[PDB]
Amino acid sequence: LGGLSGLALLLVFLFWPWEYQPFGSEGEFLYSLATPLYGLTFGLSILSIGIGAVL
């Protein structure tokens, strides 16, 4: 799960509709959760690795 989430971080960072979108614009919803997806993938990956190590 840590590895899959790390790959998810890589793929999301490389290919996701980042960049600011002015307001009420198509792509504003994607932008709004762009950064949350970066953090979710990264944190989940390293947290799962840590949980595996602890286990």
Partner: peptide, 21 residues
């Protein structure tokens, strides 16, 4: 050593999750 490294991994995971969410 292993548990400290794993704790470091989990702490940085919590920090990244919170930076995202």
């Amino acid at each position: 050593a292993v548990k400290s490294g794993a704790f470091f991994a989990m702490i940085t995971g919590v920090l990244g999750l919170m930076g995202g969410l």
